[PDB]
Amino acid sequence: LRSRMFLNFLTERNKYYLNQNLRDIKIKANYNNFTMFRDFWVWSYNNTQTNAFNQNLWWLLP
Amino acid sequence: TAERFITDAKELNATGSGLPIIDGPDWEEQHWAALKAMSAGRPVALPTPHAKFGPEDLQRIAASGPRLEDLTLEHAERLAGPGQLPTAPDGVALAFRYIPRSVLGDFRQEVEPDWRSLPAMSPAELYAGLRARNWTSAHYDPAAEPWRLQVFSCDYKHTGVTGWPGYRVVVTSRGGRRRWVDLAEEGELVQLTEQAPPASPADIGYSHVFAQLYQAYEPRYSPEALAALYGSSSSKGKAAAAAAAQHDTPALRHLDVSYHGTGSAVAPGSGTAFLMQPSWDAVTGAIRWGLERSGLPELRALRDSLLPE
């Protein structure tokens, strides 16, 4: 079963062609595990979900 | 409408990187200064024919009229040069033929009358008058005088006051006198092949009028052609009968129709168009352009602050 699933995902991603190392940085980033400004931004955005003022928050992230 | 690729050294020599572009007054203003000097009486320079005619051509043109061939020029714009890629050892040019707008003279559409001091006619009257000169109708008569119709569509509708919807017809009769009809408000939608008044003579809009204008120009055949295509037991006999049949169009004796657009006198983005319809986007973009011209050198104050940074 684990095999089929891999073959399917592989062919679906490899359909791309029919027409440094990234993991280094893609490990290095602040992910909210499910440092000072992140939690403030998150709480503000979650407490301003209903109003239009929320818009001004969007221009403040990287 | 068919163009050409050019890979021929002697031909690329006479052009190079592409023929020059002729410039001057745009096609709708070339004859202003010349005509005004003409009527003023001063001596004005002569026009020189194009460098492609020669002696034998000017004799043909000033004799019986110009041909289509006397107007089609061509143009050649050179692509990549000599030392770029194989199969093109010296370069290639695009050659395309075309006719310019200047061939049309000082000809323009009919001028828009002054609709204030002009007598009016009801649309029902125009509908009856077009039924009169429509030989496919039941109310036809061969005694009606010829009518000249000019149908105007407004063009300063979206810029400035006084624009109008719909069409405006100008009728000219035998005496040379004119009236006009205000065919705004398309009355009731009917097909082009419709013959029935709308059961309320206030329901005449350009639908019925254009139905009658389309029906009046139907060709009328003589019944002998019909007998020839009908009775002949032959097949190609019927074919030659339908090929040799003639017709007449009474519409060429009663109506002459012309379409015009009442041109505008205000540019859709000019300054006299902003005073007539002020807005908010207008002033914002206007002072944006103003700062771009005047104080956008703050784009250099950027670097001026980035030196102390």
């Binding site: - | 002569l46 026009p47 004799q59 828009e112 009358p113 002054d114 400035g160 006051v161 006084t162 007539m276």
Partner: protein, 47 residues
């Protein structure tokens, strides 16, 4: 050096009396057309 062409190959020849009935516009007609063009020019600004 220059080349010369006759000027009588470039001036067109017309016949005012050989034209259809009402093709040529009279004086009052041209004056009306001029007044109309002026009105078309100044109407929107006046309003």
């Amino acid at each position: 050096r220059r080349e010369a062409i006759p000027a009588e190959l470039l001036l067109v020849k017309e016949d005012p009396s050989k034209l259809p009935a009402g093709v040529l516009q009279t004086r009052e007609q041209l004056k009306q057309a001029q007044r109309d063009i002026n009105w078309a020019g100044k109407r929107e600004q006046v309003f």
